[PDB]
């Protein structure tokens, strides 16, 4: 869960650079594929295991 | 599921399951119709061979 966004998957450090105002990354299916951790401002890709 | 109960979530989910399932029966019908054209070609290619 990130900020209420429930899901299941494997988290890994992203090379994606979010701009200051983004919290979620979306794929072509509009599913959240990346997220900025709310305590430490670095980006995880979310992948189904 | 992040926001509704096991009583109204279902009333929404039922429409995602219906739509996405119809999106499969449509894709499978398209593949079966195309498979029949590739077969006509494969039968001509075997006859050319």
From Swiss-Prot, chain B:
It comes from the Viruses. Subunit of the fusion protein that is processed upon entry into the host cell. Mediates fusion of the virion and cellular membranes by functioning as a class I viral fusion protein. Contains a viral fusion peptide that is unmasked after S2 cleavage. This cleavage can occur at the cell membrane by host TMPRSS2 or during endocytosis by host CSTL. In either case, this triggers an extensive and irreversible conformational change that leads to fusion of the viral envelope with the cellular cytoplasmic membrane, releasing viral genomic RNA into the host cell cytoplasm. This is Spike protein S2'. It comes from Severe acute respiratory syndrome coronavirus 2. The gene is S. The chain holds residues 981 to 1029 of 1273 of the full protein.
């Amino acid at each position: 869960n990130f900020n209420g966004l429930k899901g299941t998957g494997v988290l890994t450090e992203s090379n994606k650079k979010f701009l200051p105002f983004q919290q979620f990354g979306r794929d072509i299916a509009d599913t959240t594929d990346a997220v900025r951790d709310p305590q430490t401002l670095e980006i995880l890709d979310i992948t189904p295991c | 599921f992040s926001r509704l109960d096991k009583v109204e979530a279902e009333v929404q989910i039922d429409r995602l399951i219906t739509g996405r399932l119809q999106s499969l029966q449509t894709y499978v019908t398209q593949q079966l119709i195309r498979a029949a054209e590739i077969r006509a070609s494969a039968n001509l290619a075997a006859t050319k061979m």
